[PDB]
Write an enzyme that holds these catalytic residues in place. Structure first.
Site, PDB file in Angstrom:
ATOM      1  N   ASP A 148      -2.214  -2.466  -5.500  1.00  9.36           N
ATOM      2  CA  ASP A 148      -1.190  -3.191  -6.390  1.00  9.36           C
ATOM      3  C   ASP A 148      -0.657  -4.537  -5.825  1.00  9.36           C
ATOM      4  O   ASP A 148      -0.580  -4.501  -4.474  1.00  9.36           O
ATOM      5  CB  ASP A 148      -0.244  -2.041  -7.042  1.00  9.36           C
ATOM      6  CG  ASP A 148       0.880  -1.903  -6.034  1.00  9.36           C
ATOM      7  OD1 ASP A 148       0.354  -0.747  -5.457  1.00  9.36           O
ATOM      8  OD2 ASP A 148       1.788  -2.599  -5.904  1.00  9.36           O
ATOM      9  N   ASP A 157       2.695  -5.135  -6.318  1.00  3.40           N
ATOM     10  CA  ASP A 157       4.068  -4.924  -6.587  1.00  3.40           C
ATOM     11  C   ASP A 157       4.528  -5.217  -7.857  1.00  3.40           C
ATOM     12  O   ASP A 157       3.958  -5.223  -8.926  1.00  3.40           O
ATOM     13  CB  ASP A 157       4.989  -5.194  -5.296  1.00  3.40           C
ATOM     14  CG  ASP A 157       6.302  -4.530  -5.520  1.00  3.40           C
ATOM     15  OD1 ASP A 157       6.534  -3.276  -5.552  1.00  3.40           O
ATOM     16  OD2 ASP A 157       7.420  -5.275  -5.169  1.00  3.40           O
TER      17      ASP A 157
HETATM   18  C1  LIG Z   1      -0.529   9.551  -4.457  1.00  2.80           C
HETATM   19  C2  LIG Z   1       0.894   9.244  -5.070  1.00  2.80           C
HETATM   20  C3  LIG Z   1       0.860   8.013  -5.884  1.00  2.80           C
HETATM   21  C4  LIG Z   1       2.132   7.643  -6.389  1.00  2.80           C
HETATM   22  S1  LIG Z   1       2.586   6.000  -6.438  1.00  2.80           S
HETATM   23  C5  LIG Z   1       3.974   6.005  -5.327  1.00  2.80           C
HETATM   24  C6  LIG Z   1       3.625   6.373  -3.833  1.00  2.80           C
HETATM   25  C7  LIG Z   1       2.528   5.269  -3.498  1.00  2.80           C
HETATM   26  N1  LIG Z   1       3.217   4.854  -2.112  1.00  2.80           N
HETATM   27  C8  LIG Z   1       2.872   3.603  -1.661  1.00  2.80           C
HETATM   28  C9  LIG Z   1       3.048   2.370  -2.457  1.00  2.80           C
HETATM   29  C10 LIG Z   1       1.813   1.662  -3.231  1.00  2.80           C
HETATM   30  N2  LIG Z   1       2.313   0.567  -3.678  1.00  2.80           N
HETATM   31  C11 LIG Z   1       3.803   0.224  -3.582  1.00  2.80           C
HETATM   32  C12 LIG Z   1       4.635  -0.512  -3.846  1.00  2.80           C
HETATM   33  N3  LIG Z   1       4.501  -1.407  -4.618  1.00  2.80           N
HETATM   34  N4  LIG Z   1       5.952  -0.132  -3.405  1.00  2.80           N
HETATM   35  C13 LIG Z   1       6.150   0.866  -2.693  1.00  2.80           C
HETATM   36  N5  LIG Z   1       5.396   1.655  -2.265  1.00  2.80           N
HETATM   37  C14 LIG Z   1       4.043   1.429  -2.705  1.00  2.80           C
HETATM   38  C15 LIG Z   1       4.681   5.137  -2.199  1.00  2.80           C
HETATM   39  C16 LIG Z   1       4.665   6.433  -2.930  1.00  2.80           C
HETATM   40  O1  LIG Z   1       5.072   7.688  -2.462  1.00  2.80           O
END
Ligand SMILES: CCCCSC[C@H]1CN(Cc2c[nH]c3c(N)ncnc23)C[C@@H]1O
Ligand SMILES: CCCCSC[C@H]1CN(Cc2c[nH]c3c(N)ncnc23)C[C@@H]1O
Ligand SMILES: CCCCSC[C@H]1CN(Cc2c[nH]c3c(N)ncnc23)C[C@@H]1O
Ligand SMILES: [Cl-]
Ligand SMILES: [Cl-]
Ligand SMILES: [Cl-]
Ligand SMILES: [Cl-]
EC number: 2.4.2.28
Lengths: 270, 286, 269
Positions: free
Chosen positions: C209, C211
């Protein structure tokens, strides 16, 4: 059915304002709220008042989880809070209102989710979006209401929330400016975050009470300066709330609350 | 009004210096009337016994931050107990030494920095005595930090460093990291952009708590390395810090030994009165 | 003798990949790892697979137990995969980033084994972090990505936030100004602890993504991350699989000796 939780509701607990008053101590799965919930109608709108610091407690140790959970369980659709804050910008003067739209978290000790692994009432992991932490529709009513009252008001603003209870050093104050913060306090985080997990439309009325310590030919913040400025300007936030409340009551919310509910639901991994 | 006058020995109706990190001062040639005292505080045990005595006729109290045998991580030092103990012993002043990393070219290893600001990057640390859980410190304390370090002490330190001909910097912002790891290079660079000049692991919350206690607190920072931001320079390690400390410890020791008597002969009543007031008027109670 | 611990090793636990499979639950002085260790050979190289979330929030993952267990099993190397948010236009969703630095925005996390409370790790450890990620591994990862023709970035700074919430927009912008390139919730303190253990650690970051900093773009959500991972997980998997045998054929004695020394001489006793 609109029901407005109000945190920091300066002077609202008064027989001339709060009709059908009732007072209720509650327990939550996260512990006791800061104080009893004060229930009643203000201008024919159901409200629930909650005193953040009780009446004794440092911002780090406020039970933000219990406070928000209790307001949720009472049926609050909305939460409107007031906070004092320091100004980090020349044009935000002491006494001005700031309808904040963003935050920078400088807290360190604070639980920020209900979904902590340890509560059957909140199972799984919650990754709540924070792109827009504050309820846009409530903020717009706050803005337009401030204009109607002729109050100095800022339509947007970034609040940096520090851990406290100490105030910031001057090096810190300057660095916050450079990070894009506009105002500074000790309570917005994680209140705003938790309200979002709960699917509540949350907005904050920030009142600037000092210029922190960044400024030239200006006296630095102290408890005494904050307390004096609040005393001189509390009436403003009180009028703003009181005038906002009935407008919230007559606004359509079903779509707004449906989307908040969906956003909170689809944030949880089970 | 009252002049402190003498006539034929008689006057009508008192500095004590707490020293943390007091390099080589616990020595019979220096500390006269030595005495050693383990204490309890409402916040627990200090890092080590308090070493009491006179240095150049000024009452001092020495405290080792990491304990005898340097056994505790900066995150887990009992800063509350240390400052409370020094307060309870009657210290008017605290002067500390700290090693640190330099974030600026012109602050060379071996240089003294009389810091005047900090940036807190700690996460785990109690920073107030007024924590809801101690009858000795009732209410909520929001202590001002616009000027965290005692200006008058800092001035004596600066002028004393000049008299000794030492490389010294009159101001400086210390970033205090949580540790115990050192900073990444991305962190080091970002700290530079935030305006930090030196880096360490102990200034916060020592400085904060001293201020709540109404104590005039100042810090002697000795640069031991250039952290890891620098080109054609080798990164920080425990071994590099230790080596640089060893080569340069004599500097901070001389500085202290020469500062101590000047603190002893300086007027403080107004300064300490204002600190006392600032601390008092910081506390909220119902 | 190379042995590769793999955290987040998407799809490697498969009979067609992992030969001589064996599954082992372990205890450590820091508690239970997130899950059993899966032991076996991949392309004739000894590996140990560990699932990071086993379900559990990033703040409460037992990073100490995970790294200790991999150390105790004899891992010389750790290669991890992580999802992340992109803080830069040129790092697109689906890209790989072979990160070389981090910025710590965590607050609640133990970051050392040397915590005063374990006879297995006595004293205070001040580990250096100038180069948190194993250079030689990273180089193999980069060259391997090129051979596969994958979109890949040779360097990158990861900001690790506490979570579990995502970042506000003010935060996202400020992270950019601090020099962060990608954003996650797990790199710190995994990387720190691997370094204290004398393990050569490297990370394969997959952007999922942008953010929430970007214009004419939709903000991050759990659903958006999950969708992007599903569409792009194959990439990290091929990259790991192709990296593993090159690690196996590389000389490491000096590199590991220096890591071992650096960890040892970091401890005050
Ligand atoms: C398989 C589970 C998917 C659930 S989406 C949330 C997950 C994704 N992880 C990384 C992650 C990707 N984009 C991010 C963002 N913009 N900010 C911070 N962390 C991320 C952190 C977290 O434990
Ligand atoms: C009883 C009324 C007087 C209270 S003074 C202490 C209060 C004020 N709160 C907000 C506040 C205003 N200015 C600020 C500044 N510059 N920095 C950080 N917080 C602030 C935080 C805190 O818990
Ligand atoms: C006397 C034992 C010496 C062991 S080296 C580790 C010590 C040094 N302290 C200060 C210190 C110097 N340089 C620094 C740097 N670059 N970053 C952060 N702290 C520093 C922190 C710590 O508790
Ligand atoms: Cl920070
Ligand atoms: Cl506040
Ligand atoms: Cl230090
Ligand atoms: Cl992550």
């Amino acid at each position: 059915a609109v029901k407005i939780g109000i945190i920091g509701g300066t002077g609202l607990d008064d027989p001339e304002i709060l009709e059908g008053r009732t007072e209720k101590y509650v327990d939550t799965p996260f512990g006791k709220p800061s104080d009893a919930l004060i229930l009643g109608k203000i201008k024919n709108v159901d409200c629930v008042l909650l005193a953040r610091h009780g009446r004794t407690i440092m911002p780090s140790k406020v039970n933000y989880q219990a406070n928000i959970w209790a307001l949720k369980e009472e049926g609050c659709t909305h939460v409107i809070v007031t906070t004092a804050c320091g100004s980090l910008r020349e044009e935000i003067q002491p006494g001005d209102i700031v309808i904040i739209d963003q935050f920078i978290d400088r807290t360190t000790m604070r639980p920020q989710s209900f979904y902590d692994g340890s509560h059957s009432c909140a199972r799984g992991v919650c990754h709540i979006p924070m792109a827009e932490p504050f309820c846009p529709k409530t903020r717009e009513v706050l803005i337009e209401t401030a204009k109607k009252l002729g109050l100095r008001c800022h339509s947007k603003g970034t609040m940096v929330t520090i851990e406290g209870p100490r105030f910031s050093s001057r090096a810190e104050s300057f660095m916050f400016r450079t990070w894009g913060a506009d105002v500074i306090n000790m309570t917005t985080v994680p209140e705003v975050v938790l309200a979002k997990e709960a699917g509540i439309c949350y907005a904050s009325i920030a009142m600037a009470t000092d210029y922190d310590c960044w400024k030239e030919h200006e006296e630095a913040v102290s408890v005494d300066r904050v307390l004096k400025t609040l005393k001189e300007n509390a009436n403003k936030a009180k009028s703003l709330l009181l005038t906002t409340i009935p407008q919230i009551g007559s606004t359509e919310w079903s779509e707004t609350l449906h989307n908040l509910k969906n956003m909170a639901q689809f944030s949880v991994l089970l």
